Amino acid sequence: QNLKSTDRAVQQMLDKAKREGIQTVWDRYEAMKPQCGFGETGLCCRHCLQGPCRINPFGDEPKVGICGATAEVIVARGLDRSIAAGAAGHSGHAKHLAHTLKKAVQGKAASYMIKDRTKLHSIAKRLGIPTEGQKDEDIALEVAKAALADFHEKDTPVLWVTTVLPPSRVKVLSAHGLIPAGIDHEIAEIMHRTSMGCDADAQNLLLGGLRCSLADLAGCYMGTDLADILFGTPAPVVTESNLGVLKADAVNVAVHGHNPVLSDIIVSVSKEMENEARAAGATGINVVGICCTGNEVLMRHGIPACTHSVSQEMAMITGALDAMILDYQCIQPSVATIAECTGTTVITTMEMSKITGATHVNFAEEAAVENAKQILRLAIDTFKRRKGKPVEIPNIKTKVVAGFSTEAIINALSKLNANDPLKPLIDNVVNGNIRGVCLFAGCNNVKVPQDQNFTTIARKLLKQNVLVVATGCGAGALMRHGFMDPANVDELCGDGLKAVLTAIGEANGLGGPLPPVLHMGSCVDNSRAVALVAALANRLGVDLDRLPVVASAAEAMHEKAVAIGTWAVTIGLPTHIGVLPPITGSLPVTQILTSSVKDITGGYFIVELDPETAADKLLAAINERRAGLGLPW
Amino acid sequence: QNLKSTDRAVQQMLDKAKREGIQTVWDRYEAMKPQCGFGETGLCCRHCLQGPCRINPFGDEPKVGICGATAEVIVARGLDRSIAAGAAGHSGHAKHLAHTLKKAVQGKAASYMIKDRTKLHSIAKRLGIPTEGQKDEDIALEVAKAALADFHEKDTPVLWVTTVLPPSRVKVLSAHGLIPAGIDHEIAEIMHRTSMGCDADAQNLLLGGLRCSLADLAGCYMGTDLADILFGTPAPVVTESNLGVLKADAVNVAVHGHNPVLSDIIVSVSKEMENEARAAGATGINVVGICCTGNEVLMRHGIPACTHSVSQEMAMITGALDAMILDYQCIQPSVATIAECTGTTVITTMEMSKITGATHVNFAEEAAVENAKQILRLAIDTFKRRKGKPVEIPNIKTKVVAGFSTEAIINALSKLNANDPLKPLIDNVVNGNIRGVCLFAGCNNVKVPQDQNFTTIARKLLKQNVLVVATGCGAGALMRHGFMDPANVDELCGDGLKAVLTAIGEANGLGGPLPPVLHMGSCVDNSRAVALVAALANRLGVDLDRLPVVASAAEAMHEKAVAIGTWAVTIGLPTHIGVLPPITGSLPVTQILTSSVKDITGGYFIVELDPETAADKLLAAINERRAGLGLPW
């Protein structure tokens, strides 16, 4: 089972699933092998009814698509559609939150409100919306309106790009025609250009992809901004992770998906319903997180994280998961069927994301509390039904310190330098105590033993004094393996990094360090890393492609992760991907994405499946940046 | 060669291509066989980096996708993405025209103007935009603004749906949540919902597809409306079709793609440049059409059509095609390479549609005449280079009467009943002289011997007194085989239909009938058939799903054609498709699209690859409609 997951709790549940005959994602993977090599390499097209077309990577015919599409074109079109799909997900989540905010401040949904007034005003100032003499509800309405306006063409480009990067970066991107005109506009233009008999020049196609990846960035940044207004900007919080956060004697309710608009209300209403759960024989309602909706409520409220991506089914296998409350994205639809075996009540809530066999609740903001109580009552009923049934919850959990928004990082640093908070971080980059910064982002992927790349690469980087930050299932991996527990700083961190984490931690009164890795939140909250890195670039008076900052989507899976990797490259970062995207069928496309794009944006992909090698390549990238700033390395 | 194309001119060029060693679409097809059966049946997914996933149609594992996606889900997601892609193309073309109109009336591009004032005012009235006391430029600005607003969410749904169908149809669609909220909004929502770990219920997915197909309809209707304002509403016109419209002694320039925004200017400027072409030794500039940009200029100006879809390369093989001027969609990218052998100058013009090896001209409305002259001068240079080179233009062409906009059909009918123009058509439906109406739409497809389905089915329908209308490459097929020549009415038409075509024709002073098939224009101009059918439904006080009207995408290829077929079903029509879309891997999805959707929209797909059988099924569908109206059949 160690060949499937490096998480011991997952291994334990994989043994239980096997003896019970419950098929898992890893079983379904095994049943799929050998996988199609045309698709793996990107040399397949189904963009018209003359296909499917394929191209042999090597050898004889077929060499070209039926319409004449080359390997270059086919690979680039496929990639562009994945970027557009990722942009559609992040920006759909953001759009939904914009509508929520509008409802809140129009008095249409009293369960929602402006929680973070400081965030609201800062965003309005970033955007150039006046605040002086305006009511908060009106400033919010303006913010929501501006968010919605970034989805279509208008007299300005997408402000959730141009107002979040430094002018010198915007100027480089503008020069190459890369600034998006509108989020849904770009998504549609990708779908058009990639359709049969349209764009058929790899460079042109890939420039379009880069632009659409910035539309994805805008969606991410918008989603973080709006969720912080509605639900609060995260600050440091202490919690736990892994399956051992489940409790046999409680009603265990997982919140799973990405948009926390209802799950944030579930957290608050569950508390209210404690005496009702006790009436049903439970100690209370124990809300736990899966995936990014889990990350959202972890970051804001300290809700413990149960599990992430690839291992999500394992929470059900314990027998103790009374309900799984779903929004959208990254939910294996197997959960609906596994529920028949495990007894879990799986509940969908969003109109555009249903799963055959799951019970659907028509969530509406105006009815959010009513919805939450209905859902929680189903969970309580489910808990009652498992009266007397043994459960098998692995007694495995880690301590997690999280909540490191960019605001929180800047505040923590300000305890070392109140009026120039970034300076202590830069001072330590310069003196070598911090070698650089690495963002771990993205998924787990069944192809890679769960967490192995994230932990292998992080361990090497941390020993080499890299400041590591993480989001999404990268954060999930690292938290489940102890990288968010400050007790592990001595073991994991190089001396320079330890000194910095300790100095910041002791200035924040902790009597001890920051954790080894800073959890910056959900997948949209990759935008928080952009804010930090843009702030550093502006403080130094350089562009992002001069900073010793890299990214690693070490176990990438979703189209969303491909979009994030692509905008990381576009904003100027060396960006590792630890699974093969479907590009290797075209050497020219590979050479653009790994090499010639450096000349355009300064960033580039590093495609490397061996994690020890990837760590060495990431360090080399960091060190090349240091050398370009004239620093020792 | 008759196994490849039923067009004799195409056969002749296929012989020339073979002896010259120039690879064609049919050669590339042969090199692709056998094609992948997973893709053909829809049982392949590449929506995340855990794939590719496939499912065996029959037998053992794999049975399910890695994430748990069933065959139902995989098939429905794939189909939905094709619909969204088609919507992106039609609506991208419409969007571009909206911007053109705005430029025109703002004084930013004097080559463009309001040509059809009557169309402008009728559209403004349909939309509820005031005209009384307003300047034309301001009414136009309002129309353009309304067009652009239909791409995003706002306080109304998409007006290019709700204002073009009858209220009773809109009410049925609204009840099922099918009215689009915004064109690019829906495209993005499809891409989101179909991404990994989102929507996973076939019915839910397919309802989303139906809604997105209405966004495609809106794009089609918008595109027709705006092109008619800018360029003129078509009226009856006489021209010719097939390769024999090329002239050895002239500069032959093809206009190819779908958006005629520049090619309409090329038509007018080419005339201006006659004395300059004569200076270069040519008789003049002979502009000819390929595909839908060809249809646009045929319908408005009587520009002869050279060829269509699958056979497009054959125009180059003649050796006489001096230039091919490309916009976007349905252009085989092979043309750029074939040009190296044939000498043709292939020129791209749209930013998002380039082809490696083709010369690019950065078209801008403000510079349209300058662009046109540059392009025409390249063509003249090319003509000079082939001085003394024999060419092989098949001496094969047909006569074509076309230009049957809905306005033109209503006008023609009005000569029989001035104040109730639809009544003579309805009277003849009722008395059986017209059995019903069939729209032929969509592509050719290399899988089907070119034109064979269109001509086989049309011939059977016409003998059974069906009024046949056609667009796109369906029109192209029928025109190249003589179905737009009124001289062929005696041979092709049943006695009842002949009597009607004759009575209308003689009332329009023609001394003879309308042609056997009415050419209603380009692919966006499928919207014209919707206008006609909606007008009939309103005149009868019934919904579209009670009318004896059917559609046939007999040789479908492009994602655009899948979107059109889907909205034809959604608005209530029995809709034949003569190529397999990738659905047969899921019986449940097939049963929804061919059967249970009848209960939702009244329409349904008829999937039938044998054209004689398809004709019988289409007649049965027509006759069932007649029986439901209490009519003899």
Ligand code: SF4
């Ligand atoms: S777009 Fe070209 S390469 Fe793709 S399926 Fe159609 S014919 Fe084949």
Ligand code: SF4
């Ligand atoms: S979305 Fe599911 S079925 Fe599709 S490739 Fe990914 S794991 Fe396979």
Ligand code: FES
């Ligand atoms: S041939 Fe396998 S992914 Fe298409």
Ligand code: FES
């Ligand atoms: S396995 Fe052939 S289309 Fe994917």
Ligand SMILES: [Fe+2]
């Ligand atoms: Fe996530």
Ligand SMILES: [Fe+2]
């Ligand atoms: Fe067309």
